[PDB]
Amino acid sequence: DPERRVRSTLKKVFGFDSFKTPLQESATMAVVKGNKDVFVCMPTGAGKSLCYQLPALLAKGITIVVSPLIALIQDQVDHLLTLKVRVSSLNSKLSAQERKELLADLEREKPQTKILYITPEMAASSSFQPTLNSLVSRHLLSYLVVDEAHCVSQWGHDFRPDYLRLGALRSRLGHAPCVALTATATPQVQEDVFAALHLKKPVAIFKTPCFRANLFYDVQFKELISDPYGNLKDFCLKALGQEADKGLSGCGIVYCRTREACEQLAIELSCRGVNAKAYHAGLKASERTLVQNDWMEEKVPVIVATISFGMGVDKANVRFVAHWNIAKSMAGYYQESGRAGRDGKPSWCRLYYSRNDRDQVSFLIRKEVAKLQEKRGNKASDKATIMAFDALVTFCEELGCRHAAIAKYFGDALPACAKGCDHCQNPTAVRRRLEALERSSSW
Amino acid sequence: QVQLVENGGGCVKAGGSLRLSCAASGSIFSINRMTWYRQAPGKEREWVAAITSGGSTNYADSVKGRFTISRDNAENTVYLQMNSLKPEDTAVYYCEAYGTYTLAPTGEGEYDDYWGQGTQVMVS
Ligand SMILES: [Zn+2]
Numbered sequence: 001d002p003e004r005r006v007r008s009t010l011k012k013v014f015g016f017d018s019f020k021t022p023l024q025e026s027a028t029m030a031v032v033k034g035n036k037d038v039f040v041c042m043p044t045g046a047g048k049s050l051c052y053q054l055p056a057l058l059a060k061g062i063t064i065v066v067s068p069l070i071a072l073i074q075d076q077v078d079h080l081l082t083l084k085v086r087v088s089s090l091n092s093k094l095s096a097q098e099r100k101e102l103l104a105d106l107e108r109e110k111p112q113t114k115i116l117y118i119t120p121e122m123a124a125s126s127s128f129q130p131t132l133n134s135l136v137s138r139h140l141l142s143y144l145v146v147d148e149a150h151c152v153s154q155w156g157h158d159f160r161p162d163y164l165r166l167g168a169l170r171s172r173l174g175h176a177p178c179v180a181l182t183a184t185a186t187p188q189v190q191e192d193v194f195a196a197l198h199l200k201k202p203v204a205i206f207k208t209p210c211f212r213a214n215l216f217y218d219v220q221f222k223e224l225i226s227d228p229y230g231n232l233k234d235f236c237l238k239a240l241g242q243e244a245d246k247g248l249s250g251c252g253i254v255y256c257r258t259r260e261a262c263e264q265l266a267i268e269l270s271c272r273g274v275n276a277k278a279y280h281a282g283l284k285a286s287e288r289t290l291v292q293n294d295w296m297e298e299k300v301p302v303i304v305a306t307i308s309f310g311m312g313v314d315k316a317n318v319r320f321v322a323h324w325n326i327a328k329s330m331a332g333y334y335q336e337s338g339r340a341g342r343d344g345k346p347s348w349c350r351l352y353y354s355r356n357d358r359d360q361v362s363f364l365i366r367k368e369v370a371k372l373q374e375k376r377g378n379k380a381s382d383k384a385t386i387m388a389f390d391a392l393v394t395f396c397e398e399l400g401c402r403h404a405a406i407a408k409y410f411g412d413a414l415p416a417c418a419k420g421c422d423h424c425q426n427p428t429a430v431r432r433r434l435e436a437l438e439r440s441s442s443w
Numbered sequence: 444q445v446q447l448v449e450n451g452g453g454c455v456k457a458g459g460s461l462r463l464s465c466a467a468s469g470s471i472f473s474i475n476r477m478t479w480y481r482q483a484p485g486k487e488r489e490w491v492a493a494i495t496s497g498g499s500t501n502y503a504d505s506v507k508g509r510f511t512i513s514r515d516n517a518e519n520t521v522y523l524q525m526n527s528l529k530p531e532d533t534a535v536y537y538c539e540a541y542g543t544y545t546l547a548p549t550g551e552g553e554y555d556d557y558w559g560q561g562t563q564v565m566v567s
Contacts, residue, residue: 023550039554187473191542194554205544205552413470413548 002032009057013083020047027206031055031143031179037199039149039190040181041207049076051206052145052179056115057085059142062106062135065117066169067147068160073117086114090122106131109138120162123169132172141176144169146197149180153192154380156184167198184331186384187411210334210406211415214341215349217402218422219395222354224436232265232322232352233272239320239348240274240301250319251295254304255336257325257361265324266304276302279309309336316343323351326361329388330395330409353396355441365389397437399423399430445469445545447538447559454565460526465538465559467519470552475542477521479512481534482561491536494521505531528566537561 006028010016019025024047027040032055042048056063067073070091080087088102105111122128135141150156152163170178178200180193185207194203222228236252243249254269254276256262262278269276277291277300295303296315303309307328321340327333333351341347369382395405402421404414419425446468455461467474479491492502492512500512509527514520525532537559546552 026549026551187544190544190554191475201555203554205546205554207546207550207552209548209550211548411472411544411546412550413472413546415548 002029005058006032006054009054013057013085014050014054019050023206023208024050027051028054030204030206031177032058034059034143034177036202036204037178038180039193039199039203039205039207040179041183041185041190041205042181043183043208046208048181048183052143052181053080053085053115056143061140061142062111062113063115063143063145064123064141065115065145065147066120066123066166067117068120068151068162070119072147073119077117080115086112087117088113088115089117090128091119092121103127103131107134111140120160120166124162124165136173136175139175141173144173144176144178146178146180148182149193149197150182150185150189152196153185153189155186155192155384156189157381157384159379159381164196167196170198185411186409188384190411207412209412209415210410211403211412212338212341213416213418213420214344214346215337215403216346216420217337217349217406219351219353219402221433221437222352222357223440224433228352229265229268230272232324233269233274235322235348235350236269236274236302236320242319242346248301250317251298251301251303251315252318252320252322253309253336253339254302254322254324255309255327256304256306257357257364259306261324262304262306269302269304274302275300276304279303279305281306281308307332309339314339314342317345318342318347320348320350326351326353326357326392326396328361328365329385330391330406331388333392333395334406334410351396358393358396362389362393397434399427399434444553445471445540445543445555445557447540447557449537449559449562452536452562452564454567455528456567457529459528459566460524461528461564463523463525463536463562463564465521467540467543467557470545470547471519472544472546472552473542474519474540474544476539477512477514478539478541479521479523479536480539481532481536481564483531483534486534489534492523525564530566532564533566534564535561536564 028051030036031038031051040048040051070093073089077087077089090102105113146166151158151160152166180197185193220231225231239252240248240250254265256265259280259282262280266276266278277294279288279291292310294300318340321337327336337349340349365385369385391409401417401424403417407415417424423430447465449463449465451461451463473496476493476495478493481489481491490503491506492500492510494500494512494514498514502510511524513522540557543557544554
């Protein structure tokens with residue numbers, strides 16, 4: 001059966017005895033059957049690549065993989081080579097001799113090349129059209145793959161005019177199933193992907209959900225709070241106190257927009273008896289490395305940071321993530337809040353919302369969009385930037401499951417919140433606080 | 444897969460009124476365009492009216508002001524209010540679910556077009 005082959009090739013070539021996840025498996029099987037175009041939207045470290053690489057080995061012919069830049073392309077080729085897989089890369093960073101060695105290999109009946117990584121520039125160039133023409137005619141194309149598929153959308157962050165030719169490409173390669181992959185797609189970006197690449201219905205979709213059961217999402221209104229600083233300390237004390245025998249157990253992050261706010265919030269927290277240190281661009285590199293160190297090694301349980309917080313920094317027992325100030329985007333909030341509870345254990349994610357904060361950020365977004373518009377003219381992404389903020393304001397100012405609002409933005413199914421946010425745990429108490437906010441709104 | 448099942452047809456007299464309901468089943472997240480077509484026997488399929496996700500609506504000239512469509516967003520269901528009916532309007536009425544995004548919490552979905560079963564509408 002096909003399962004017997006796929007399991008076997010997974011083991012013999014790639015080395016694994018079972019797939020990471022049954023979603024990775026399902027995607028993989030759907031590409032193998034080859035009746036449908038496929039969209040795979042999984043985050044970094046999911047093994048999204050396996051879902052087109054493994055099926056490529058099990059087919060009769062060649063798999064063209066279109067990736068936007070060679071840095072990306074190169075990583076894959078080296079690893080595939082190490083697995084003793086017959087891979088090749090066609091780019092304009094290559095000598096005429098290497099280029100022509102490869103163009104030649106492709107014009108063979110039964111080429112050496114099983115998988116061909118190619119840049120969009122090259123996949124459109126006159127130099128390649130005839131090679132492609134011969135490959136289709138000899139029925140040697142098993143699959144067209146488009147990586148970083150989101151680049152085709154003007155509503156995505158990384159638009160490339162290059163990618164607009166890919167739809168015409170897909171059309172010519174009609175007989176061949178098309179796979180498109182990315183980590184990052186709003187529903188609007190997914191609709192742009194399916195349209196612009198001319199994917200064919202039914203498009204089968206494999207999309208890792210945002211939802212993490214062990215995170216508890218809630219919003220507090222700084223306007224309706226006598227001791228904001230004191231509220232925060234209690235939130236930190238709850239979160240850090242889930243093993244009283246150890247005393248303080250775990251660590252937490254407080255996120256601020258400004259450096260002044262960091263320094264101040266660190267001092268306020270420290271006084272009320274929760275040891276906290278400020279991390280921002282203001283400090284010397286040495287102070288930063290020392291503060292990061294103290295947090296990582298649990299000397300100091302709480303770090304107060306600007307957007308500067310390290311990408312390479314991933315800790316396992318982050319018991320809470322407090323946004324003192326609303327973030328620039330729903331995506332930013334998801335990512336920053338999502339640094340919590342990577343060890344699977346219960347964690348708390350809290351947004352401190354003020355309309356004054358909303359207004360300060362709202363404006364700063366529009367200012368830095370204006371500064372980009374003077375340097376490169378208009379872009380439909382500028383509209384996306386503003387709507388990315390609206391979605392987070394809407395998260396704060398509506399009644400409804402917090403996890404569900406996050407899922408609607410990203411395009412997931414309604415998640416299984418087990419009284420896992422404020423609204424699901426007590427709907428009426430949320431209505432109370434929302435009503436209370438609207439009383440200040442009068443006039 | 445997805446079910447479109449239309450309801451709320453029957454026989455009524457000229458000048459009378461019906462309201463059709465089309466119900467969409469399955470894990471539907473969104474529908475790009477929901478569209479009302481009618482098939483009069485021995486005539487070509489006729490485009491009636493349609494509504495975008497976000498509630499933009501347009502209407503055939505032959506039914507403008509008499510007919511109006513709307514969407515129970517909660518229900519993933521559309522309605523076609525037909526008042527001032529005429530013998531012309533006698534037909535089978537069905538819906539097209541263009542750009543129908545479906546998705547389970549597993550992360551496994553589809554994106555497809557779907558067609559309805561139809562409801563009979565007689566105008567004396
Ligand atoms: Zn909830």
